[PDB]
């Protein structure tokens, strides 16, 4: 049974800062990894999709809807980076994976402005 580890646990982000979020996919089960986001703009927990990286070759898929960038660091480590932090990408992130048609989720990472 696969478990995903997001890093870090939280991010209190400065305006304009670049944030890498990384998610290690353990076990050894599935294809790529899907990155998901919950805009702080929504009062009701509405997950929006962000990107999917294939496990096999470097081959991402971004939904149509500058800000993000993603790569597969060596092995099992899927990086999602927000290029410039702002109110737009301010919210909660997590990766997801699909083995034997079962969805798995990492913890959620609150990336929220400065304090």
């Amino acid at each position, epitope marked *: 049974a696969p*478990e995903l*580890r997001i*890093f*870090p646990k*939280k*991010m*209190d*982000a*400065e305006l304009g*800062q*670049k*944030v*890498d*979020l*990384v998610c*290690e996919v*353990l076990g050894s089960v599935s294809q790529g990894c899907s990155w998901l986001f919950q805009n702080s703009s929504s009062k009701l927990p509405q997950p929006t999709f962000v990107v999917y990286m294939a496990s096999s070759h470097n081959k991402i898929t971004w939904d149509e809807k500058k800000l993000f960038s993603a790569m597969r*660091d*060596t*092995n099992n*480590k899927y*990086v999602l*980076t927000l290029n410039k932090f702002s109110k737009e990408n301010e919210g909660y992130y997590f990766c997801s994976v699909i083995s034997n048609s079962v969805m798995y989720f990492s913890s959620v990472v609150p990336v929220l402005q400065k304090v």
Partner: antibody
Amino acid sequence: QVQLKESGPGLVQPSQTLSLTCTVSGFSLTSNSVHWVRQPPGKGLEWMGGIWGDGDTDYNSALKSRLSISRDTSKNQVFLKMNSLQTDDTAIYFCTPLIGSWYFDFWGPGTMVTASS
Amino acid sequence: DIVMTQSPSSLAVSAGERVTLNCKASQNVRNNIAWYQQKPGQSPKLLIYYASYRYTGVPDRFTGDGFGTDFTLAINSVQADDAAFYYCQRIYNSPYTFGAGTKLELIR
């Protein structure tokens, strides 16, 4: 690519403050954390504390009151200040980061710091 | 607390034997454990992460077992190079406490 080197005066007069620098390469301080582990001669390893991507610091209760970790992100440097050194503080000090993971897979080589007059 | 207890204090074993080191956490921490190997005068070297995963480069014979409170580093046919200290660490939550280590001595 990933590398850390600990530097600082290798002899501290007792009651003075230890100051070490850890210069880093191969990753950003902005998204990862750097931690200090120390190891007295013949004794085991000891997590001391660390500093996170966003500047948050985290110490271990044993040393909370006399420990101070900061960083200069513009020069890839993380510092360690420790107060009123004694005999029991003589050790090797390692900096070792968490990059994208929650385990310590990369380590600096370590510096000896004797507390003696 | 979360106290980390490693037993035994030290072992004498022979080139080619299986060995088992134990690690006990006063609290439940699922699989949030790391194992390291250290030769005196050297930095620790990560062997095993999240209780059971072997780090890239680490040889076949190093294996890790356990979840909750009791954890096990095992070496299947030990070799002379394995004479070292072995430490477990709690991993995900602060403090990331170290066991007092186990010493692995060899018989020839």
